[model samples]
Target chain A: INILSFREAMIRSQILGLIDNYDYEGALNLVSNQKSFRNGKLLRKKLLSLTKQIKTHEVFPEINEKYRDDALKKSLFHYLLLNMRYNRLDVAETLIRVKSIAEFILKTYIEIHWPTLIIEKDGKPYLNDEDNLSFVYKYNLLLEKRKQNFDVSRILGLPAFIDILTILEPNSQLLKEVNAVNDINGLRNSIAHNLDTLNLDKNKNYKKIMLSVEAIKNMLHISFPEIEEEDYNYFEEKNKEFKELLE
Target chain B: EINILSFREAMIRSQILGLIDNYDYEGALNLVSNQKSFRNGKLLRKKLLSLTKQIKTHEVFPEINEKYRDDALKKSLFHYLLLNMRYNRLDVAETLIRVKSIAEFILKTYIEIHWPTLIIEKDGKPYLNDEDNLSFVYKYNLLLEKRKQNFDVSRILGLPAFIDILTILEPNSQLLKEVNAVNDINGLRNSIAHNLDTLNLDKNKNYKKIMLSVEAIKNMLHISFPEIEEEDYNYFEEKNKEFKELL
Candidate 1:
């Protein structure tokens, strides 16, 4: 019935498809350094050459007037494409985690935990559940991308939101992925907290962060409805498969 | 014929669409001017022109017009379509001129709306208007049709972008179908006489003559380009200029 949840599902599939078997950050690094998004001479050099030519001809002289404009065009376009790649990977996980988690928690919580009512200050505005002044998250789906935030932890880190998961599905093996979520939070912290401190050694970090994403994806794949299966082989079967595969 | 893109190529393409999905270009450019909303879109035009190098000289359509015959105009047309996409200033579907840029606008703007949608509303309905953006992304998303049918776009863009686009599709497959498809632009045009001015792009950039049948590419995008409300227009003019005094 909710749409952003549906939107998140689609975006998540794209993110996973893009990452494929390689872990998320590992896949990102190929383009992170902005090395070869295409052939060495293919997209970049060819594109620049073409842009240069477009600026040279002057049927209408004003279009090609600015010297800075022309050079910056190449740089800006290059960085735009370069920066865009990094930005997408940076936000993709957050998009899915927030959407899936909220919907999962709300619907599940209402179904299981709400049998008993706990009142905080009921906002005169009556929401369906708890009516207990629950904090609003715009229809319970988070869309944490404005190209402005650096912290995926606030939005992407799943472990932080584990409080209710335990109360609701006490025996669920989902706890195993908890470590993966925490590590990802570690990675997410470095990214948003002090991007200046990022020590991105592709050779060293790619492998670690790569599977790190897979672990998260594995958890994200489980739907809210599915989490109710306490006997679910989440930790042993499904969870373990993705964890090691990512490894 | 199926082609496995060299690993690097695939990642690069995936990244482009991903960034376009979330980053605000016109909005970012709006930031450059810092108006409450739209105005002197000059900054957007410049930065956007810079981001345009990717398809600068790529030929898109051929002209049967007198000045030039059998030339690649798609590259030139692509940039033009891109700028208009950002402007969202359509004279109605006279030219939806569908571009991945269409998807770019849908996403970035969605996030822009989400900033407020996150805290204030219960349904997060604030960001996705009943009409424009949600359907816009869907229509532009429909551009992925060739991929589903395994059209040539897969070879040109990486497999993952094409594939992720597929995942985004299922959400609205039924809704998308009920709606009218996009406006089909007749690429073959003139520069000075009947808008022959826009046709003077360079060669070597053939506009994917191999584009999967136009039947698939059409998606009522232009009609859905969202009518520029008088307030948006009034504010954009005053604010864009208000945001900047550089000129």
Candidate 2:
């Protein structure tokens, strides 16, 4: 038989096995051990190339650290790039741990600083003091005012912060909004918990995680507008470099 | 009369001493009542009066015909002690430990015994072997039984009446098919109680206890109402709806 025929037969067998739920161990073993034969190797390479394209073309090209805190922006950019690289290679185990650490940092920062950044309706973000009252209390009052229109649970991620900024000043460009924090948390849980049995696809989960990361970066930029262009370029270049490794 | 009063005081003191010996000072305090002294005095005086008449008869003889009476009180006390050791004044940590044990038991006994018959492989994942709609109908039935028993227990405890109207199972009810889900609940509860700061309380909040309670209720309902609808083809869709509606 020709190489193409052999590849077709093997692919058919694998697909059938997968459909039957009998190929998980085999699939995992093949992927982990790099046992792709002929056309399998080509298919793997094609997937890797697409991942690289997403990283370099879609993600890296969008890094604009011109309006972020210098050190924090650099750290986030480095982490995002690292994540893209890990994702491209399908190193699920390591990717999960790194993602968890990054998520923990982001969430901790938000929890600590959200009160200060939140503002009442038609009010600018203000510091809490004896005269001004606490920012948290003001945020709650703002929430109460809008309670009839909004569900508090839906007020999540970067979008909620952006809404606060908008409420404070209609023309405010600070804090770009985003959604799917829960999805990011879910992705982290799937990977960290090794929920392979849940049939989570790397491509889908990786894209979701990256999208949230980018949204967070944008929000950070709006919040702190002092980041350097050089650092931004470095971030983009690093992401490209990582992408290149997969291809 | 004075002697009778002394005897009653001795009995009270002995009971207290017994509790102290067992490191159950709290139990001893709960058992002591303000009216007990007067009631004990009357009972003791009556016993003393009967004792004098019995002594006057002078001939103390072992009646072989007398039925051998078992110590029901001792047996009851021992059972209480055993239950206390298993589940009494359980804090979050202790509850977690018990939950883990229960999970382990379910995994080893239930999953291993039933999974092969009850689950089927589909696209490299296990699906319920039973009809789709009825998959979790059994769970609801189980939950109902637990709810009834729980209500009964609550009533027996003199608590206000409560009916667990929240009958819907969660989205990940399939995870319970393996029994390790109980351990997951324990872990979630531990995180919520001990590390509340780390808990994702808005979207993923109360998931642990919700799952545990649901599972318990479902199992009990199944036992109690096995003749009810055995199949619910839309179980997955219904569960998804319930999950989305979670507060």
Candidate 3:
């Protein structure tokens, strides 16, 4: 008999649970049978319970003064909550709400901050007066602002969306040819607005999303060299904390 | 003589029936000799002519269409073959000789049908944009240059390295030297094709020479196709499995 390592056994247990969620009890029994895999199974079970509790509860308090407007606060709160529910049953609902909020926030930000360059086409925000501004210029401006202390991560919530922007406005042509930017954007839109229309399997979507996230992380690293690991951890932890407030 | 005629008839019938696999070079030559009753004098010429037409019109195109194009193989067989012809062992040269006429025929036909105005300059150069004026020599050189650009180590080393070299070399002379490097690579390819078994075998010694040749070709291609990625060494290493299987 081949004895699997502790890590391998845990991975196998997790795979079995994910592949057959309905048979999770049986998967748990299988994990318990292996001493090495038992702790991981228990951990996953606790995480799942926490997730369920967070989704079901509504214990979050509102602070009207902290936000610029009620709608903006509501939207931000919704995004935080939805981001927490990324892999859960509420994913579809969360995505839809997040998309609407994100669109509003982006439009509002552009209107207030860069009105001369921003334009509304059928209620969607776009760079209309870009004759004097190339993609490089916009990218450089974003980079410069980021250097000065702009919260780029807050502005671009979905890691994949940031990746798309990076590819579309790269410093060089090689990044553009890879076309990862457009691909991630298409994936983000599909997941947000038309998930049911996708012909791909869940595994494929998961892989695609992971790739997008990786690309975004890479692009951010390149563009904002001053960004610290603590900044990333802070954003993630804050996102989680805000999500918990919803509970 | 009657026996010879019968044997020839049998061989021709078997070939027509698709019993002779393209890879079975020795078997084909044996059949041809058997058909000639061991006279063997004209067997090479007869086999060469027969196989040349068969490959050009039937075998190569179908294989290319089925495997390379259908699979989205990324790199075409012609591209790989050309590279191998320029760099690999005597075996590659032998294979090229076996398929030379067919390659020429297909390339010529492709140019005629797809690019009617194909021509070459007095200096023996061809430009990609002027497909209509592309000459046969230009087509061959273009393929060679593309192969060199893609596989050459100097070009593959990094863009930063090229920039360093550019800063040192005289601009016009450097440009001309680069063009001559492509011509030299094409000459090496021709030598390998015509003298398959007699070419040099010291890959270690040749690697640097080939790299320098490739750098020039790469620079030219970069000017034309500005979007090509500076692929990491890891990228090629990742493809080790596929390439090993291919070999």
Candidate 4:
């Protein structure tokens, strides 16, 4: 077992390095062929994650190139388009991806407004508060209310991100879209928490959710003007082109 | 008098285009549909109809409705598969996972339905017994062996699973034999799973082979296969146009 663990870690790093080079297919190949690692829970998760990245890149290659220097933003941008791409196919899956996008967007805001709220340790991200900072305390306090003991683990959920935003920027219009998508059609919560089957009227529900994703991007332009508008335009244009296939 | 009528139709078309530009698909539809003498009116109406309509799951992959039944994960994976197929511009590298996933689904779904004995329970929780050979392909292979011996095999999904499952089934079954016979999508699946080398490939041929393979697998499973509808042909034709434009 120890030998397997050590060998798997080596393989994991190799796969990650391949992904880092944007050789997603290569990374996928290695993971698939490696006899040492079967469909282990961790490995299956990695395969799904790699497939998601590869699918997103196949549709929109510019994302990986655009944010090549910033892994976090690239991932955020990738999922935003991915959510839109999957909107009609599986609204529940789209819901999960969009919610993730929402969280990353909020995190980006934190990166700008309250840089101190985030900390790093051993090349991993963590959250800390040595000076009793207002946002940090409120964030940790919310965790306390949920009985989740705080480690500097920096890992937080969407509701907490929204909660912090409510305190920091009450008047921001982005929050409207954020709230709209937080649990669009009341399906997200049930799916996220309950592992329940999504009984959606597949037709009616998506427009609201898709538009909310678009709306979030629109608000992002206003709120985070430094982010490229061209990327958003390109996505919208592609959306139109796909619609042209409707006939 | 003819010039005047032509001018009026042109103005209406321009107005509808402006509404479309403003993202008022419904407004454009209303304006365009009101014109009786508009040249290209039928084409424009079809375009608008497609623009206004939500892309349905069955619209892209008709077999999804007849198959998947009510499984969310299968539907989600099918949508993902279609998205990759539609967006991949002649890159057989991109097509492999899409085609492979369908094969995996066909086998995985079969195992789930007929081979409940493969899953063993421990401490009130059921899990696939083969912890090490967790790849779907291997699991599928085991499944075939088990089926042959009135005993044996299964896990997770994707190319390795598709291949592993096929290898096991090939000796005992006619269904997989036919699927493997047609250009060996498994070889391609294995190549894609193991390496990044390109081949002289026509995506159309690849598409047809994949369709034939999956349809054959469906037939073997006793699932009803729908005749390839006009819409299905039109769907891929549209994707081909988009792929050309992509280049």
Please report the candidate that would top lDDT against the real structure.
4
**Any runs in candidate 4 off by more than 4 Å, and if so which?**
A1-96, A120-125, A129-136, A143-154, A168-173, A185-204, A226-232, A235-247, B1-247
lDDT of 1 by residue, B76-123 (tens): 223333334333332111122233223323322223333333212112
Task: Show where candidate 1 strays beyond 4 Å.
Answer: A1-160, A167-169, A189-217, A220-247, B1-247
The 10 consecutive residues of candidate 4 chain A with the worst lDDT sum are A238-247
Clashes of each: 26, 15, 8, 6
Provide C-alpha RMSD values for all models, in order. Answer: 24.9, 31.0, 26.6, 19.4
Error of 3 at A179 (Å): 11
What TM-score does the predicted chain A of each candidate obtain versus native chain A?
A: 0.30, 0.35, 0.34, 0.54
Q: Model 1: what TM-score?
A: 0.22
Model 3 residue A114 lDDT score:
46
| Candidate 3 TM-score, true structure as reference | 0.22
Candidates ranked by DockQ: 4, 1, 2, 3
What are the runs in model 2 whose C-alpha is more than 4 Å off? A1-70, A80-87, A90-177, A180-183, A189-206, A216-247, B1-247
lDDT of 4 by residue, B1-247 (tens): 6765665555555545444433334344555565686766776677556534423222324444464455633343343344344334333444553444444444544444545444443432233556434454355555646545222332223333334444553446554554463336666654333222223245436666655654454343343123323343234345334322322
Quote the lDDT for B167 in model 4.
56
* Candidate that would win on TM-score: 4
lDDT, candidate 3, at B172: 45
* Model 1 Cα shift for residue A108 (angstroms): 4.1
Worst 10 residues of 3 chain A by lDDT: A149-158
Q: Model 1: which docking level applies?
A: incorrect
